[PDB]
Amino acid sequence: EAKPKFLSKAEREAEALKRRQQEVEERQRMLEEERKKRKQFQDLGR
Amino acid sequence: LRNSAFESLYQDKFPFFNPIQTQVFNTVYNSDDNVFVGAPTGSGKTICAEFAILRMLLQSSEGRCVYITPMEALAEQVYMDWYEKFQDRLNKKVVLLTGETSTDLKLLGKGNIIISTPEKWDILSRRWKQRKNVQNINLFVVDEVHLIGGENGPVLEVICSRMRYISSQIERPIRIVALSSSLSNAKDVAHWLGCSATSTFNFHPNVRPVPLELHIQGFNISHTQTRLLSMAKPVYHAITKHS
Amino acid sequence: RCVIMCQGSKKDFFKKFLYEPLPVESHLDHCMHDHFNAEIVTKTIENKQDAVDYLTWTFLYRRMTQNPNYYNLQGISHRHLSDHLSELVEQTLSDLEQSKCISIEDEMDVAPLNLGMIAAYYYINYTTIELFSMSLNAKTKVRGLIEIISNAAEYENIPIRHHEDNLLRQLAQKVPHKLNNPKFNDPHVKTNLLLQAHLSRMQLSAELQSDTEEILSKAIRLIQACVDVLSSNGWLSPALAAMELAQMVTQAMWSKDSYLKQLPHFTSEHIKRCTDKGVESVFDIMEMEDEERNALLQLTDSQIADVARFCNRYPNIELSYEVVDKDSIRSGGPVVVLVQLEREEEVTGPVIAPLFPQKREEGWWVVIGDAKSNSLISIKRLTLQQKAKVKLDFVAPATGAHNYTLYFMSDAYMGCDQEYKFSVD
């Protein structure tokens, strides 16, 4: 919110690990949906 | 201006104020908000400081301005100005602080206009819970807050942030009047010093009472004694061309 | 009109920043530790949450949200701003706890230690007292103490210009202490040489005494910081060495020279003529007659105006000391020694500072210690203007009597090293 809270360095890097785990999970999700789009594009010509 | 003694130190100097002071006057003198005056060097912002001081001496005569200039020679120059202006003609004590903490508490207790450098006010305001004379100042003028972006500039920032933080705690607000050169990001200095959007007079560098004609001559000489000696005849030619 | 002759590389930098208004950005994140230490000793910052809460009052917080990438930020969101402020405060408080200036308990609550109180009292950079309490041992002396004080980070902004190196090398061959590995690119060995040249009252170039007056403005608070760090560390002899350095840096004389070079218009002819008669102090000279004051060496009619007011204005203070329960003290009990400081002359004006730049008021150290064990028992600073009072308590350990010594040492004048030896229990 408005007042910035202090976050400890262990807590900051835990938040950063949770963040980078989130976006590597959405990168994995987008990659397997990319595989789904690719299979869909592939079998509409086969 | 209202009081006759207040005009008696501006009568023979000038009949009319410069347009920056005309626009800034009703907010500095006839109001009580924190005022940011961002005007170019030479617009007479120290007379806007003096407007704030005359307001502070209207509210009660035992008030206390604290005037911060970032350079010690500027503090000496404004002390020579205001000792002739406010002590000789208004009999209000103008003191100038020096680097001794033992005598600065006495000078702050005895003075109505407390000239300082940021490092001389830093050592007083660091113990502002102890020193009552740091707390109940009625006006905190900070000349040239645009020197917040230089060396010996963090100390100026810390003492103005502390003088805002004290004003957030002491039952009576310390009215900050921040004078500066004309800033681009003056909304941030206004928001940091509690100035309004109506009390933030951030002007432009073209607004000056005497218009500045600024020519810039490039000397593409990378060696610097060579450039510094190649500038010697264009110095004289600039003197003959321009003045 | 203003004609700015500049290098053409710098030309468009001036075509921007002089016609359009000025963007100012706070540089507080690099110069933070002093003010954090100062708000910690004030108990304004009592935990790291209040360190962030104090940092929200600054211009730095207001500029981190409008120009983030100036401050190594990656966004103006509450997460970016809060974690950058938290990294800023937990870096500066790590720098203050690693300096032993503050103490962090529960990894959240900060408290002022001794070094932080000393660093925020007399306005010294935290790394200077980090250097002081790491670099002063129990056997340091004025020969090394000027190396300690010249290594203060309050002197890194001394100017090194061009053609400053070799006349400093010319200064490196003269002054009464040599320098191990002197690099004349250093600000610190320059301030060492200039401190020694002020103490040896040598001739200087005008641009170098222009920097010597810059040095001596901050010298006296550094020496008082040395006095206080050796006060807390409990070392009698380096503390008295620092109290000697404080008075000699105000009177521009050395310690291994005698104590009358303090007086104005007195050169080495007077040293050589007074040593060959049997007289060394100014108390050995002020006990003469006016003709005998003039029948010692040369004289002129301005000398009698200034030397007499010098002898008027130095501290003519004798002691009075008082102990309660002299026989009836045992092991464990805290004991007092009370000192009244009988000044017998009027104070009309500050110290005589003919070579020192500032108008300084005189201070005092009522200090007590161990004349054999080199154990600094207690010390209090003092400003009196007339006969005042100072009480100081301490604790004596067991097995009976302990022979203490009381010293009275100033920061501005020689000839008043009053020590009085006594014992308790």
XYZ file of C-alpha atoms in Angstrom:
714
model
C 0.000 0.000 0.000
C 1.194 3.512 0.844
C 3.657 2.953 3.682
C 6.540 0.720 2.515
C 7.087 -2.132 4.938
C 10.530 -3.412 5.812
C 11.164 -6.913 4.494
C 14.173 -8.850 5.768
C 16.822 -10.101 3.357
C 15.822 -13.729 3.892
C 12.186 -12.688 3.413
C 13.100 -10.574 0.369
C 14.969 -13.406 -1.320
C 12.180 -15.836 -0.409
C 9.744 -13.476 -2.133
C 12.133 -13.282 -5.095
C 12.406 -17.090 -5.240
C 8.620 -17.386 -5.113
C 8.363 -14.762 -7.867
C 10.875 -16.474 -10.161
C 9.198 -19.835 -9.491
C 5.876 -18.250 -10.512
C 7.146 -16.861 -13.797
C 9.079 -20.012 -14.637
C 5.777 -21.820 -14.012
C 3.933 -19.514 -16.397
C 6.785 -19.903 -18.890
C 6.290 -23.679 -18.637
C 2.517 -23.232 -18.952
C 2.899 -21.000 -22.004
C 5.347 -23.492 -23.527
C 3.003 -26.445 -23.148
C 0.111 -24.368 -24.480
C 2.498 -23.526 -27.337
C 2.852 -27.278 -27.877
C -0.953 -27.522 -27.860
C -1.256 -24.737 -30.454
C 1.438 -26.465 -32.489
C -0.316 -29.846 -32.424
C -3.571 -28.101 -33.372
C -1.904 -26.308 -36.300
C -0.164 -29.534 -37.301
C -3.147 -31.879 -37.466
C -5.350 -29.404 -39.374
C -3.097 -29.971 -42.376
C -2.494 -33.658 -41.829
C 3.178 45.068 2.775
C 1.425 45.926 6.008
C 3.585 47.336 8.787
C 5.356 50.702 8.433
C 8.549 49.399 10.006
C 8.504 46.610 7.422
C 8.332 49.046 4.525
C 10.987 51.288 6.098
C 13.652 48.771 4.988
C 12.352 48.594 1.394
C 11.464 52.240 0.680
C 14.620 53.593 -0.941
C 15.797 50.266 -2.395
C 12.966 49.778 -4.900
C 9.456 51.239 -5.299
C 7.982 48.097 -6.890
C 8.918 44.467 -6.363
C 9.951 42.255 -9.266
C 7.102 40.185 -10.814
C 8.294 36.986 -9.122
C 7.874 38.692 -5.755
C 4.482 40.104 -6.788
C 3.199 36.637 -7.661
C 4.829 34.970 -4.648
C 3.928 37.682 -2.095
C 0.318 36.779 -1.267
C 1.258 33.171 -0.555
C 4.404 33.929 1.412
C 3.311 37.030 3.312
C -0.489 36.815 3.294
C -0.692 33.030 3.804
C 0.868 30.446 6.114
C 1.517 27.451 3.853
C 4.846 25.868 3.082
C 6.039 27.699 -0.019
C 8.374 26.476 -2.724
C 9.764 29.327 -4.837
C 11.688 27.965 -7.778
C 13.112 30.989 -9.567
C 16.438 31.520 -11.387
C 19.460 32.860 -9.539
C 18.955 36.606 -9.629
C 15.179 36.738 -9.276
C 15.403 37.898 -5.668
C 14.144 34.829 -3.845
C 15.847 36.021 -0.668
C 13.213 38.763 -0.588
C 10.642 35.948 -0.615
C 12.509 34.557 2.387
C 12.222 38.024 3.882
C 8.479 37.997 3.166
C 8.231 34.782 5.175
C 10.305 36.358 7.935
C 8.084 39.442 8.063
C 5.065 37.130 8.331
C 6.781 35.242 11.165
C 7.511 38.555 12.906
C 3.878 39.567 12.444
C 2.518 36.411 14.089
C 4.546 37.012 17.251
C 7.647 39.153 17.631
C 9.545 36.468 19.568
C 9.363 34.098 16.626
C 12.301 32.264 15.141
C 13.261 31.900 11.505
C 15.987 29.426 10.621
C 17.652 30.179 7.305
C 19.690 27.431 5.670
C 22.089 28.181 2.883
C 24.158 25.295 1.505
C 27.341 27.355 1.111
C 28.995 29.083 4.050
C 29.896 32.168 2.015
C 26.232 32.534 1.056
C 25.448 32.382 4.776
C 28.004 35.135 5.418
C 26.552 37.275 2.629
C 22.963 36.908 3.806
C 24.126 37.556 7.379
C 25.676 40.839 6.240
C 22.437 41.643 4.409
C 20.027 40.774 7.200
C 22.054 42.185 10.074
C 21.740 45.532 8.322
C 18.120 44.828 7.420
C 16.501 43.054 10.382
C 18.735 43.980 13.332
C 19.443 47.619 12.491
C 15.942 48.554 11.330
C 13.598 46.056 13.006
C 15.722 45.357 16.167
C 15.240 41.611 15.716
C 18.277 39.518 16.584
C 19.923 37.991 13.516
C 22.546 35.433 14.431
C 24.753 33.340 12.175
C 25.715 29.906 13.391
C 29.306 28.710 13.477
C 30.666 25.220 13.946
C 30.561 25.143 17.771
C 27.681 23.259 19.404
C 28.269 24.970 22.767
C 27.554 28.482 21.457
C 25.013 27.525 18.790
C 22.436 26.568 21.411
C 22.899 30.034 22.910
C 22.696 31.720 19.496
C 19.571 29.733 18.643
C 17.976 30.610 21.969
C 18.819 34.299 21.631
C 18.273 34.828 17.906
C 15.163 35.465 15.843
C 16.781 34.732 12.458
C 19.192 31.817 12.663
C 21.479 31.719 9.620
C 23.193 28.393 8.998
C 24.867 25.892 6.747
C 23.368 22.369 6.636
C 26.194 20.867 8.662
C 25.862 23.530 11.347
C 22.118 22.942 11.627
C 22.560 19.172 11.387
C 24.506 19.019 14.656
C 21.787 21.025 16.380
C 18.776 19.237 14.926
C 20.206 15.755 15.535
C 19.156 16.081 19.187
C 15.903 17.929 18.529
C 14.092 16.020 21.269
C 16.516 17.517 23.789
C 16.844 21.024 22.337
C 13.528 22.823 22.722
C 14.931 25.728 20.696
C 15.230 23.445 17.668
C 11.587 22.416 18.094
C 9.661 25.668 18.430
C 11.061 27.494 15.441
C 8.252 29.187 13.566
C 9.721 29.270 10.066
C 12.367 27.226 8.259
C 13.618 28.908 5.103
C 15.895 26.775 2.950
C 17.597 28.807 0.277
C 18.763 26.902 -2.801
C 17.328 23.452 -2.249
C 18.458 22.698 -5.803
C 21.841 22.069 -4.158
C 20.243 18.867 -2.876
C 21.684 17.132 -5.928
C 25.309 17.931 -5.239
C 28.083 17.319 -2.758
C 27.247 18.452 0.801
C 23.682 17.971 -0.422
C 22.489 14.859 1.442
C 22.984 16.781 4.694
C 20.670 19.522 3.392
C 18.128 16.845 2.503
C 18.389 15.238 5.930
C 17.924 18.500 7.785
C 14.908 19.486 5.685
C 13.415 16.003 6.062
C 14.007 16.268 9.794
C 12.495 19.743 9.883
C 9.415 18.343 8.199
C 9.361 15.332 10.546
C 9.645 17.602 13.592
C 6.821 19.752 12.207
C 4.758 16.564 12.014
C 5.156 16.091 15.793
C 5.309 19.326 17.809
C 1.661 20.624 18.065
C 2.505 23.574 15.770
C 3.782 23.302 12.189
C 7.211 24.579 11.216
C 6.426 26.598 8.106
C 8.982 25.623 5.481
C 9.800 28.131 2.759
C 12.088 26.453 0.254
C 13.770 28.783 -2.195
C 15.538 27.264 -5.149
C 16.743 27.647 -8.648
C 14.052 26.803 -11.184
C 13.463 23.063 -11.020
C 11.979 20.584 -13.422
C 10.904 18.129 -10.720
C 9.598 20.779 -8.361
C 6.465 18.781 -7.614
C 8.730 16.353 -5.746
C 10.386 19.084 -3.689
C 6.915 20.481 -3.050
C 5.528 17.097 -2.005
C 8.599 16.464 0.133
C 8.332 19.842 1.883
C 4.548 19.890 2.120
C 3.973 22.671 -0.373
C 0.636 22.798 -2.166
C 0.061 22.859 -5.903
C -0.987 26.507 -5.456
C 1.956 27.395 -3.196
C 4.628 25.863 -5.437
C 6.023 28.718 -7.496
C 8.318 26.862 -9.841
C 9.195 29.335 -12.535
C 11.263 28.985 -15.696
C 14.845 30.101 -16.398
C 13.420 32.633 -18.918
C 11.430 34.402 -16.199
C 14.329 36.463 -14.772
C 13.950 40.242 -14.245
C 17.053 40.910 -16.353
C 16.911 38.528 -19.349
C 19.935 36.292 -19.682
C 21.596 35.993 -23.086
C 23.590 32.803 -22.757
C 26.092 31.978 -25.489
C 28.050 28.734 -25.285
C 31.323 28.386 -27.179
C 32.579 24.903 -27.890
C 36.335 24.409 -27.924
C 37.099 21.023 -29.442
C 40.506 20.775 -27.751
C 40.731 17.640 -25.650
C 43.933 18.655 -23.906
C 42.902 21.028 -21.199
C 45.864 23.345 -20.729
C 45.781 23.700 -24.508
C 42.039 24.417 -24.361
C 42.586 26.719 -21.385
C 45.205 28.719 -23.314
C 43.190 28.607 -26.531
C 40.363 30.247 -24.581
C 42.454 33.280 -23.585
C 41.943 35.338 -26.730
C 38.225 34.384 -27.085
C 37.773 35.661 -23.515
C 38.894 39.098 -24.683
C 36.898 38.769 -27.895
C 33.788 37.887 -25.886
C 34.446 40.962 -23.742
C 34.713 43.148 -26.846
C 31.671 41.603 -28.535
C 29.262 41.293 -25.625
C 30.137 44.034 -23.098
C 25.150 38.050 -20.954
C 27.038 34.880 -20.147
C 29.574 33.293 -22.473
C 30.375 29.756 -21.384
C 33.569 28.596 -23.025
C 33.540 24.845 -22.616
C 34.916 21.774 -24.307
C 32.655 20.799 -27.196
C 32.137 17.408 -25.573
C 30.389 19.298 -22.758
C 28.543 21.734 -25.028
C 25.134 20.081 -25.337
C 25.222 19.242 -21.619
C 25.069 23.004 -21.059
C 22.604 23.634 -23.859
C 20.264 21.362 -21.940
C 20.658 22.224 -18.301
C 20.835 26.019 -18.392
C 17.845 27.037 -20.496
C 15.466 24.332 -19.298
C 14.926 24.038 -15.518
C 17.019 21.899 -13.255
C 16.401 18.237 -12.455
C 17.596 17.610 -8.902
C 18.031 14.095 -7.567
C 18.879 13.189 -4.008
C 22.199 11.467 -3.388
C 21.285 10.330 0.102
C 21.625 6.602 -0.597
C 25.421 6.928 -0.797
C 25.742 9.317 2.175
C 23.282 7.558 4.437
C 25.135 5.998 7.384
C 25.822 9.245 9.272
C 22.187 10.283 9.504
C 20.992 6.756 10.225
C 23.482 6.553 13.092
C 22.339 9.972 14.276
C 18.670 9.054 14.264
C 19.556 5.816 16.038
C 21.315 7.603 18.912
C 18.288 9.932 19.086
C 16.072 6.796 19.317
C 14.168 8.053 16.290
C 15.126 4.865 14.450
C 14.517 2.158 17.035
C 13.976 -0.714 14.599
C 14.502 -1.324 10.892
C 10.812 -0.653 10.256
C 11.307 2.839 11.654
C 14.444 3.080 9.513
C 12.246 2.672 6.435
C 9.664 4.942 8.078
C 12.329 7.609 8.606
C 13.562 7.145 5.053
C 10.049 7.889 3.783
C 10.442 11.469 5.031
C 13.338 12.174 2.687
C 13.606 13.504 -0.848
C 15.082 10.119 -1.723
C 11.727 8.417 -1.229
C 9.996 11.075 -3.311
C 12.513 10.735 -6.138
C 12.616 6.940 -6.147
C 9.027 6.930 -7.437
C 9.491 9.548 -10.146
C 12.946 8.579 -11.425
C 13.468 4.983 -10.335
C 16.416 3.972 -12.498
C 18.566 6.734 -11.026
C 18.488 4.716 -7.790
C 18.921 1.186 -9.244
C 15.191 0.550 -8.981
C 13.133 -1.505 -11.408
C 9.684 -0.090 -10.725
C 7.602 2.348 -8.738
C 5.381 -0.342 -7.210
C 5.083 -0.834 -3.456
C 7.047 -4.088 -3.683
C 9.976 -2.545 -5.586
C 10.029 0.596 -3.455
C 9.624 -1.256 -0.154
C 12.274 -3.849 -0.940
C 14.720 -1.276 -2.259
C 14.250 0.825 0.870
C 14.580 -2.303 2.990
C 17.784 -3.281 1.177
C 19.061 0.288 1.642
C 18.399 0.252 5.370
C 19.643 -3.286 5.914
C 22.815 -2.415 4.019
C 23.486 0.782 5.976
C 22.670 -0.844 9.307
C 24.911 -3.761 8.381
C 27.582 -1.142 7.699
C 26.903 0.414 11.100
C 26.854 -2.874 13.023
C 29.969 -4.106 11.221
C 31.520 -0.782 12.262
C 30.268 -1.597 15.814
C 28.452 1.759 15.848
C 24.989 0.259 16.449
C 23.724 -3.098 17.700
C 20.988 -5.150 16.031
C 19.011 -7.519 18.254
C 16.436 -10.013 16.870
C 17.684 -8.862 13.405
C 15.031 -6.105 13.598
C 15.604 -3.812 16.593
C 18.571 -1.446 16.473
C 20.147 0.384 19.383
C 23.028 2.865 19.645
C 26.356 1.531 20.847
C 29.267 3.572 22.162
C 30.970 4.287 18.834
C 27.712 5.478 17.304
C 27.125 7.869 20.194
C 30.632 9.256 19.717
C 30.181 9.479 15.941
C 26.883 11.338 16.166
C 27.894 13.574 19.073
C 30.809 15.364 17.436
C 29.570 14.879 13.829
C 32.137 12.395 12.528
C 31.734 9.980 9.615
C 30.988 6.447 10.818
C 33.967 4.982 8.969
C 36.315 7.401 10.714
C 35.415 6.006 14.126
C 35.359 2.539 12.541
C 39.002 3.346 11.776
C 39.562 4.910 15.219
C 38.409 2.099 17.498
C 40.129 -0.416 15.195
C 43.312 1.636 14.825
C 43.901 3.011 18.326
C 45.579 0.561 20.682
C 46.561 1.042 24.311
C 50.093 2.152 23.338
C 49.503 4.684 20.582
C 51.126 8.090 20.842
C 51.079 11.542 19.174
C 53.616 10.329 16.581
C 51.084 7.801 15.336
C 47.968 9.683 16.419
C 48.416 12.262 13.661
C 48.516 9.332 11.234
C 45.247 8.140 12.797
C 43.550 11.539 12.610
C 44.925 12.272 9.145
C 43.409 8.984 7.969
C 39.936 10.265 8.869
C 37.364 10.177 6.084
C 36.579 13.821 6.823
C 39.755 14.596 4.852
C 39.078 12.669 1.645
C 37.572 15.850 0.175
C 40.848 17.748 0.607
C 41.875 18.957 -2.869
C 44.653 17.408 -4.880
C 45.264 19.711 -7.823
C 47.990 19.524 -10.423
C 51.498 20.583 -9.284
C 50.546 19.542 -5.746
C 52.724 16.441 -5.586
C 56.348 17.513 -5.570
C 56.167 20.381 -3.092
C 54.402 17.921 -0.803
C 57.396 15.656 -1.448
C 59.443 18.695 -0.396
C 57.227 18.725 2.712
C 57.845 14.995 3.235
C 61.548 15.557 4.005
C 61.184 18.205 6.726
C 58.293 17.623 9.171
C 59.077 15.942 12.540
C 57.616 12.520 11.626
C 58.312 10.449 8.533
C 55.682 8.663 6.450
C 55.846 4.951 5.702
C 54.810 4.577 2.019
C 53.779 8.170 1.178
C 51.826 8.436 -2.082
C 51.232 12.114 -2.815
C 48.042 11.293 -4.688
C 46.554 10.578 -1.256
C 44.433 13.195 0.484
C 45.373 11.584 3.802
C 49.146 11.904 3.667
C 48.609 15.482 2.471
C 46.583 16.204 5.608
C 49.259 14.410 7.633
C 51.992 16.635 6.197
C 49.840 19.738 6.599
C 48.981 18.880 10.205
C 52.687 18.419 10.939
C 53.559 21.655 9.130
C 50.944 23.502 11.167
C 52.398 21.969 14.325
C 55.959 22.908 13.291
C 54.545 26.366 12.271
C 56.448 26.067 8.993
C 56.146 28.406 6.048
C 53.643 27.135 3.495
C 52.472 27.987 0.034
C 49.266 30.019 0.050
C 47.251 27.297 -1.693
C 48.456 24.760 0.887
C 47.620 26.867 3.933
C 44.279 27.408 2.174
C 43.830 23.656 2.704
C 45.426 23.652 6.156
C 42.656 25.967 7.357
C 40.243 23.442 5.822
C 41.945 20.676 7.825
C 42.119 22.406 11.203
C 38.414 23.255 11.140
C 37.572 19.544 11.397
C 40.726 18.554 13.312
C 39.528 19.436 16.804
C 36.339 17.340 16.745
C 38.367 14.390 15.437
C 40.801 14.750 18.321
C 37.899 14.967 20.772
C 36.535 11.801 19.153
C 39.914 10.169 19.796
C 39.688 11.388 23.410
C 36.260 9.800 23.755
C 37.034 6.463 22.060
C 40.084 6.042 24.289
C 37.850 7.212 27.142
C 35.449 4.332 26.590
C 38.263 1.865 25.901
C 39.880 2.604 29.265
C 43.397 3.642 28.214
C 44.976 6.486 30.203
C 48.135 7.244 28.228
C 46.705 7.420 24.652
C 43.841 9.533 25.985
C 46.299 11.975 27.543
C 48.267 11.900 24.286
C 45.066 12.909 22.486
C 44.356 15.643 25.026
C 47.890 16.890 24.373
C 47.259 16.757 20.614
C 44.081 18.821 21.062
C 45.888 21.655 22.834
C 48.937 21.625 20.560
C 46.877 21.646 17.356
C 45.199 24.820 18.661
C 48.506 26.410 19.677
C 50.433 25.147 16.594
C 53.385 23.781 18.571
C 54.897 20.340 19.040
C 54.940 18.191 22.172
C 58.668 17.377 21.994
C 59.279 21.141 22.073
C 58.869 23.144 25.250
C 55.700 24.913 26.312
C 56.323 28.581 25.487
C 56.228 28.523 21.657
C 52.504 28.955 22.442
C 53.211 32.619 23.209
C 53.112 35.089 20.291
C 56.346 36.487 18.799
C 58.739 33.969 20.373
C 61.192 32.154 18.092
C 64.043 29.694 18.695
C 66.382 32.394 20.021
C 64.162 32.423 23.115
C 64.267 28.614 23.386
C 68.075 28.619 23.137
C 68.495 31.514 25.574
C 66.072 30.151 28.173
C 67.580 26.636 28.112
C 71.051 28.111 28.770
C 69.823 29.883 31.941
C 67.581 27.379 33.741
C 64.071 28.446 32.718
C 61.684 26.406 30.558
C 58.021 27.172 31.330
C 55.875 30.291 31.143
C 55.235 29.892 34.864
C 59.042 30.003 35.005
C 58.833 33.370 33.194
C 55.558 34.990 34.347
C 56.944 34.970 37.922
C 59.424 37.678 36.862
C 59.150 41.461 36.872
C 58.259 43.652 33.864
C 61.882 44.705 33.407
C 62.929 41.083 34.011
C 60.324 40.076 31.429
C 62.082 42.511 29.096
C 65.662 41.853 30.314
C 65.484 38.240 29.145
C 65.531 38.765 25.361
C 64.335 41.225 22.678
C 61.241 43.405 22.980
C 58.947 45.697 21.032
C 55.891 47.694 22.009
C 53.326 45.455 20.301
C 54.869 42.389 21.963
C 54.031 43.825 25.381
C 50.448 44.380 24.190
C 49.817 40.817 22.955
C 51.937 38.663 25.302
C 50.402 40.324 28.376
C 46.824 39.722 27.211
C 47.888 36.171 26.308
C 48.990 35.731 29.938
C 45.699 37.401 30.918
C 43.596 34.976 28.905
C 45.164 31.538 29.518
C 43.462 29.353 32.188
C 44.550 30.325 35.685
C 42.605 27.483 37.293
C 43.783 25.561 40.349
C 42.086 22.520 41.873
C 39.823 21.455 44.686
C 39.069 17.771 45.073
C 36.901 15.863 47.495
C 36.395 12.195 48.402
C 33.598 10.778 50.573
C 34.164 7.695 52.798
C 37.943 7.467 52.532
C 38.551 4.748 55.129
C 34.954 3.464 55.067
C 34.993 2.144 51.491
C 35.189 -1.562 50.722
C 35.227 -3.802 47.651
C 32.290 -3.361 45.299
C 30.987 0.035 46.356
C 30.867 2.888 43.855
C 32.900 5.880 45.000
C 32.918 9.573 44.050
C 35.607 12.167 43.599
C 34.269 15.710 43.333
C 36.284 18.502 41.726
C 35.697 22.239 42.111
C 37.819 24.095 39.575
C 38.938 27.329 41.219
C 39.521 29.822 38.420
C 41.191 32.948 39.789
C 40.869 35.296 36.801
C 38.096 36.653 34.598
C 37.216 35.116 31.224
C 37.124 37.964 28.685
C 37.009 36.385 25.243
C 37.645 33.026 23.561
C 40.948 31.171 23.298
C 43.838 32.891 21.561
C 43.706 31.376 18.063
C 46.303 33.214 15.959
C 46.889 30.261 13.616
C 43.705 28.243 14.275
C 40.860 29.408 12.005
C 37.837 29.161 14.287
C 36.647 31.066 17.341
C 36.710 28.217 19.831
C 35.508 28.100 23.395
C 37.847 26.243 25.733
C 37.083 22.784 27.068
C 38.386 20.640 29.876
C 38.886 17.005 30.785
C 38.682 16.183 34.476
C 40.223 12.754 34.000
C 41.338 10.191 36.595
C 43.441 7.074 36.049
C 46.195 4.646 37.070
C 49.688 6.149 37.006
C 51.239 2.652 36.969
C 48.660 0.275 35.469
C 47.758 2.609 32.536
C 44.041 2.162 33.270
C 41.757 5.086 32.479
C 39.389 5.189 35.431
C 37.080 8.064 34.482
C 36.905 11.298 32.477
C 34.412 14.132 32.081
C 34.499 17.043 29.665
C 33.855 20.442 31.162
C 32.982 24.044 30.299
C 33.046 26.344 33.308
C 33.749 30.131 32.688
C 34.269 30.372 36.533
C 34.649 27.944 39.434
C 32.165 25.139 38.754
C 31.478 21.582 39.935
C 32.107 18.126 38.467
C 31.239 14.810 40.123
C 32.503 11.503 38.806
C 31.870 8.020 40.163
C 33.629 4.736 39.503
C 34.038 1.259 40.981
C 37.173 -0.080 42.637
C 37.894 -3.829 42.743
C 39.033 -5.823 45.768
C 42.208 -6.258 47.910
C 42.291 -2.810 49.365
C 43.921 0.441 48.368
C 44.231 1.668 44.789
C 46.505 4.633 44.051
C 44.713 6.815 41.514
C 45.838 10.053 39.874
C 43.672 13.019 38.901
C 44.595 14.980 35.765
C 43.156 18.263 34.528
C 43.836 18.553 30.789
C 42.600 21.153 28.301
C 42.058 21.208 24.557
C 43.596 24.640 24.031
C 46.565 25.501 26.308
C 49.793 24.182 27.806
C 51.055 24.642 31.355
C 47.989 23.373 33.209
C 48.678 19.614 33.419
C 47.607 19.399 37.048
C 47.919 15.813 38.261
C 47.369 14.999 41.937
C 48.020 11.484 43.204
C 46.013 9.851 45.987
C 44.574 6.510 47.059
C 41.255 4.946 48.082
C 40.427 1.925 50.320
